[PDB]
Swiss-Prot record:
Positions with a binding annotation for ATP: 126, 131-132, 282, 285-286
Organ and tissue specificity: Widely expressed.
Illness association: Parkinson disease 25, autosomal recessive early-onset, with impaired intellectual development: An autosomal recessive, early-onset form of Parkinson disease, a complex neurodegenerative disorder characterized by bradykinesia, resting tremor, muscular rigidity and postural instability, as well as by a clinically significant response to treatment with levodopa. The pathology involves the loss of dopaminergic neurons in the substantia nigra and the presence of Lewy bodies (intraneuronal accumulations of aggregated proteins), in surviving neurons in various areas of the brain.
Effect of residue 114 to D: In PARK25; likely pathogenic; decreases PP2A complex levels; impairs PP2A phosphatase activation
Subunit structure: Associates with PP2A heterodimeric core enzyme PP2A(D), composed of a 36 kDa catalytic subunit (subunit C) and a 65 kDa constant regulatory subunit (PR65 or subunit A). Interacts with the catalytic subunit PPP2CA (via C-terminus). Interacts with PPP2CB.
GO BP: mitotic spindle organization; positive regulation of apoptotic process
Annotated EC: 5.2.1.8
PANTHER family given in the database record: SERINE/THREONINE-PROTEIN PHOSPHATASE 2A REGULATORY SUBUNIT B, SERINE_THREONINE-PROTEIN PHOSPHATASE 2A ACTIVATOR
Source organism of this protein record: Homo sapiens
Protein name: Serine/threonine-protein phosphatase 2A activator
Protein family membership: Belongs to the PTPA-type PPIase family.
Length: 300
């Protein structure tokens, strides 16, 4: 194990990244989880292991720290400085948190794995959050699979239990500390903060008996179904946070609602994720590379 470090500094480094072992493992992981959740509600009776339970407890610790760290009165009208107090706790305690999940015989892996956790919750200096932080959380989970802490039978729970809870905690950070989107915003982005739940969420909805894409801009449909469906939960967050016509506050998603099937939405969002997140220097340039997700060319 080694200290994961940044490797994307120049334009040619984008190709280095796309040819890397890290990229192959990362995109393979996203696609594997995408397939596993296909056609299933969040309440699907999936297996729940000790490691999954410990990851939920880890996220609940993060949540508790938010409650202990209220917003401060401040002059700035953007991010709330209390975020930095919260983040400092995570920075100090990340290895301890990860150690509650990783059994002692794999203790050597804790510092490397914990770097991804420390990169998954936003930026302290800027008080911002974007799809690069979300990617680091997926990378954190990917590392836990690679070292065998999480297994194939945990894959549905990774999305429906752990990632689902992570999104709740991220929404709470974003609202509580008035966090700024880190990257492209408004007309320029799919969503101000997230990406993966629209991929995995659209996979859930493949072959649904009633819901089709145009239904996600129907407030009634979202209200009656969001508890079962990660995609719909994301839309609910948007409509709760933003006012006015959907077409104006979320134009990209508005256009996506016209797609005739969830399978086509899912296929299109995978393409879009590569183009607008993984191949986007300003979004992905802070990705860190160590031993588990290495910058060396993919083995083959």
């Amino acid at each position: 194990f080694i200290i994961p470090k940044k490797e994307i500094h120049t334009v040619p480094d984008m190709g280095k990244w796309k040819r890397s072992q890290a990229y192959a493992d990362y995109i393979g992981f996203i696609l594997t989880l995408n397939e596993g959740v296909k056609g299933k509600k969040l309440t699907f009776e999936y297996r729940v292991s000790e490691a999954i339970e410990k990851l939920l407890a880890l996220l609940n610790t993060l949540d508790r720290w938010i409650d202990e760290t209220p917003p401060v009165d401040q002059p700035s009208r953007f991010g709330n400085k209390a975020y930095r107090t919260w983040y400092a706790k995570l920075d100090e305690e990340a290895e301890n948190l990860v150690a509650t999940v990783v059994p002692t015989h794999l203790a050597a892996a804790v510092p490397e794995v914990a770097v991804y956790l420390k990169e998954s919750v936003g930026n302290s200096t800027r008080i911002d959050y974007g799809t690069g932080h979300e990617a680091a959380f997926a990378a954190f989970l990917c590392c836990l699979c690679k070292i065998g802490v999480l297994r194939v039978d945990d894959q549905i729970a990774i999305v429906f239990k752990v990632f689902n809870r992570y999104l709740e905690v991220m929404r709470k950070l974003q609202k509580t500390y008035r966090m700024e989107p880190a990257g492209s915003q408004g007309v320029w982005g799919l969503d101000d903060f997230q990406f993966l739940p629209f991929i995995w969420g659209s996979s859930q909805l493949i072959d649904h008996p009633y819901l089709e894409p145009r239904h996600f801009v129907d407030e009634k449909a979202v209200n009656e179904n969001h508890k079962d469906y990660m995609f719909l939960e994301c839309i609910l967050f948007i409509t709760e946070m933003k006012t006015g016509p959907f077409a104006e506050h979320s134009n990209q998603l508005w256009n996506i609602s016209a797609v005739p099937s969830w399978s086509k939405v899912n296929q299109g969002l995978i393409r879009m994720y590569k183009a607008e997140c993984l191949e986007k220097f300003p979004v992905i340039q802070h990705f860190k590379f160590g031993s588990l997700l290495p910058i060396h060319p993919v083995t083959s």
